[PDB]
Amino acid sequence: SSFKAADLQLEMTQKPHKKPGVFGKTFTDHMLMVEWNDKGWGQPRIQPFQNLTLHPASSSLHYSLQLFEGMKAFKGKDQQVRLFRPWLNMDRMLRSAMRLCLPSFDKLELLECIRRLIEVDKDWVPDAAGTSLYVRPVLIGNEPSLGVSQPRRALLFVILCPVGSVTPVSLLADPAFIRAWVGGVGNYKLGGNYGPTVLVQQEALKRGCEQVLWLYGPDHQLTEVGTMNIFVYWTHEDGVLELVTPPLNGVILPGVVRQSLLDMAQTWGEFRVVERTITMKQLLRALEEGRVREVFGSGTACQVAPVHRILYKDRNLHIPTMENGPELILRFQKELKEIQYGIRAHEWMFPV
Amino acid sequence: SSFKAADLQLEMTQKPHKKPLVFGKTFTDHMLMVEWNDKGWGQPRIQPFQNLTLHPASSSLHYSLQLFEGMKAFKGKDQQVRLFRPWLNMDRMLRSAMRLCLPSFDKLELLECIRRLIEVDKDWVPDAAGTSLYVRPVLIGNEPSLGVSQPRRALLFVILCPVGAYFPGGSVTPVSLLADPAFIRAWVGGVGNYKLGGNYGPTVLVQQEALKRGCEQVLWLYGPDHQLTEVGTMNIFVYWTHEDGVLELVTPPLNGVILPGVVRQSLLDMAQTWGEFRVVERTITMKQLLRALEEGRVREVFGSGTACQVAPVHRILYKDRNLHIPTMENGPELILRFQKELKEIQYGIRAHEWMFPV
Ligand SMILES: *Cc1c(COP(=O)(O)O)cnc(C)c1O
Numbered sequence: 006s007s008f009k010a011a012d013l014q015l016e017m018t019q020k021p022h023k024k025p026g027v028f029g030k031t032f033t034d035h036m037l038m039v040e041w042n043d044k045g046w047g048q049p050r051i052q053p054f055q056n057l058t059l060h061p062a063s064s065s066l067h068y069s070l071q072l073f074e075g076m077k078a079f080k081g082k083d084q085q086v087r088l089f090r091p092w093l094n095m096d097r098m099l100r101s102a103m104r105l106c107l108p109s110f111d112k113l114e115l116l117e118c119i120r121r122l123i124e125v126d127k128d129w130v131p132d133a134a135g136t137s138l139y140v141r142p143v144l145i146g147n148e149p150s151l152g153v154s155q156p157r158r159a160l161l162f163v164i165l166c167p168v169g170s171v172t173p174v175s176l177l178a179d180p181a182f183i184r185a186w187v188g189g190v191g192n193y194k195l196g197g198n199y200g201p202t203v204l205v206q207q208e209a210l211k212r213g214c215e216q217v218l219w220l221y222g223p224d225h226q227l228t229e230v231g232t233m234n235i236f237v238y239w240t241h242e243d244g245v246l247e248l249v250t251p252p253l254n255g256v257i258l259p260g261v262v263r264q265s266l267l268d269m270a271q272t273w274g275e276f277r278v279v280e281r282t283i284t285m286k287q288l289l290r291a292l293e294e295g296r297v298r299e300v301f302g303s304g305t306a307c308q309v310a311p312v313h314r315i316l317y318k319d320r321n322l323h324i325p326t327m328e329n330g331p332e333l334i335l336r337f338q339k340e341l342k343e344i345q346y347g348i349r350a351h352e353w354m355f356p357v
Numbered sequence: 358s359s360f361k362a363a364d365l366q367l368e369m370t371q372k373p374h375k376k377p378l379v380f381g382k383t384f385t386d387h388m389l390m391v392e393w394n395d396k397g398w399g400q401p402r403i404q405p406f407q408n409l410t411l412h413p414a415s416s417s418l419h420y421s422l423q424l425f426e427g428m429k430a431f432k433g434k435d436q437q438v439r440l441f442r443p444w445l446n447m448d449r450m451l452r453s454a455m456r457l458c459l460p461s462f463d464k465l466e467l468l469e470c471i472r473r474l475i476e477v478d479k480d481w482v483p484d485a486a487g488t489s490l491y492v493r494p495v496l497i498g499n500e501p502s503l504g505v506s507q508p509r510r511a512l513l514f515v516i517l518c519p520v521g522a523y524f525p526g527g528s529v530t531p532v533s534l535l536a537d538p539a540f541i542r543a544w545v546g547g548v549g550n551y552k553l554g555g556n557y558g559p560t561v562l563v564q565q566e567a568l569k570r571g572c573e574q575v576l577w578l579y580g581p582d583h584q585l586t587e588v589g590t591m592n593i594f595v596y597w598t599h600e601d602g603v604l605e606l607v608t609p610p611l612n613g614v615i616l617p618g619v620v621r622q623s624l625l626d627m628a629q630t631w632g633e634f635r636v637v638e639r640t641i642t643m644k645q646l647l648r649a650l651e652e653g654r655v656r657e658v659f660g661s662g663t664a665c666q667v668a669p670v671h672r673i674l675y676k677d678r679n680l681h682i683p684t685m686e687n688g689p690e691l692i693l694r695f696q697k698e699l700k701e702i703q704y705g706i707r708a709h710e711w712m713f714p715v
């Protein structure tokens with residue numbers, strides 16, 4: 006059925022790594038690990054940070070039967086650690102698992118195991134300004150077989166990273182490259198979605214841009230920004246101030262922060278908050294008519310990323326985000342910072 | 358620059374096992390292994406069949422920085438092993454590597470390493486009817502980092518499997534296909550035309566959705582006009598009399614959604630050398646097929662891959678309606694011919710430039 010938090014074994018480290026005096030390069034001393042097979046879910050293990058022992062014909066390495074998740078744990082002023090809406094990360098992880106025919110589990114049980122893991126490495130969580138602990142739960146197929154079938158053996162593991170912007174980012178809008186397709190798997194956080202992006206990412210760095218803007222369809226629809234969802238604060242063609250983000254139709258990943266920004270903006274009710282398709286045509290005109298206020302990306306890595314420049318077909322489009330405050334961005338960050346670092350009590354935060 | 362066959366180290370096993378079977382579950386005693394890092398390509402290693410030791414943040418397991426290849430080694434009557442057009446598998450592997458920002462290597466050097474590996478496990482190659490050794494070269498990223506970037510560290514390894522007749526007795530069973538346009542394998546400007554693991558993971562759910570609707574494999578439709586692209590892990594062919602009223606063999610052209618199959622190319626080359634009928638690479642729609650079936654113009658529909666050289670198709674389930682494909686009633690002449698000549702070429706009965714001796 007599922008692994009239990011009650012059966013959790015604790016093997017403490019006898020070779021603890023040095024704490025720092027760089028995103029996802031420094032790792033903590035401990036990692037969660039649960040195996041699945043014909044018999045079912047084994048006992049969950051909090052083991053020291055070891056290497057993985059995989060069969061050369063492991064489905065994870067051959068047919069990309071792999072999925073992951075990204076959520077942050079914030080140590081507040083009272084020095085109590087809290088996870089930001091971890092339930093939505095657990096929801097999206099199970100939806101990913103069912104898509105790749107990997108074993109289903111109890112969401113609340115895995116959360117408790119991740120809670121206990123962070124409890125053990127409690128000292129690894131930084132309490133510095135704009136710093137957190139990045140949680141990386143992973144589920145992979147591990148059947149020793151080259152058959153493209155439902156894996157008989159799987160492996161769920163979690164690893165932690167201490168992590169450390171006021172600066173805006175430049176985007177490359179090249180329609181030649183397609184991240185995901187309607188009826189694809191773009192709306193699941195599967196490794197398969199990322200491998201292809203690495204070439205497109207370095208093609209952006211070599212054209213001056215920092216991150217990629219992913220266009221889809223002949224009408225060149227704005228979908229995502231690298232590993233972030235996209236928002237546009239602007240006065241629409243109807244002449245009404247709205248916040249718009251592409252809707253969940255298969256190409257867009259349902260971001261936890263994306264959903265949090267919509268929920269937060271809806272509760273204000275001060276301006277219109279819609280999920281509608283955004284085309285380059287709409288933006289080029291909106292920029293021409295000076296209707297665009299702020300463009301930004303939302304992810305775990307970057308909570309609210311200001312966008313100042315977009316390179317599209319050898320022409321630089323200046324986005325006037327920073328000239329317009331950026332009001333909405335600074336507001337979102339402020340309230341998120343208050344919620345996350347415990348300054349303001351909220352139902353979203355899950356205490357360790 | 359690249360690893361060399363001259364620097365190849367040989368660590369022999371000391372526990373050779375089995376030699377009895379099901380596809381890609383039984384493995385040989387030895388495996389090739391070359392590591393890449395900042396310094397560059399290390400010495401290539403023929404080691405015993407061990408497990409892999411990967412960092413928990415290995416790019417291969419997180420961001421699917423992984424690609425593979427599939428080619429067969431055929432032990433002839435003279436008991437000499439030969440690889441079927443291995444150069445094209447090496448070409449497609451390098452094109453895959455460049456797409457995922459993985460290190461480029463010398464194609465001829467890796468082939469020589471794979472040749473030496475099969476030379477060591479020469480006894481593992483079966484000489485039974487319709488049996489071969491399946492070769493599985495793999496290249497993965499192995500940088501201990503959660504950054505979505507070009508991997509600083511990689512790992513190239515090759516493993517071997519003895520495999521059985523896809524069709525026992527020489528006689529061939531046909532397959533049922535599910536044509537559901539709701540599911541999309543690849544997209545134009547995607548990575549469908551590269552043999553990357555990322556392309557396959559999503560197919561497993563669509564494959565079991567076919568099994569539970571009676572069908573055996575999936576037919577992948579693309580676009581609003583419902584273009585026939587691929588069959589599961591095989592390219593698709595249609596032997597028929599076209600609307601112009603001429604007998605032709607047609608397969609979807611290489612435009613990003615189609616993987617350039619070694620066998621696909623081999624069937625085109627072989628049919629072109631005959632010059633007995635028209636051989637074209639043109640888009641095939643369901644409309645064209647539904648009409649061609651209605652007018653009884655369809656002779657044979659089949660899939661081509663390494664696993665299945667020539668797969669007969671007898672049934673296609675499309676919009677909750679079963680389309681009968683008259684492949685088996687028409688011989689199948691072209692299929693049986695293709696298999697016969699391929700079998701003669703591969704098992705050494707007929708000498709050909711395509712075969713590479715071990
Ligand atoms: C991880 C990721 C995001 C961010 O997800 P959040 O839950 O909002 O942190 C956005 N887009 C893509 C493509 C991603 O992979």
Ligand SMILES: *Cc1c(COP(=O)(O)O)cnc(C)c1O
Pocket residue numbers: 427552587589590591592616617618619620621661662663664
């Ligand atoms: C692996 C694969 C094939 C087989 O390619 P060959 O080189 O002909 O063996 C065909 N189509 C798809 C989609 C594949 O993934």
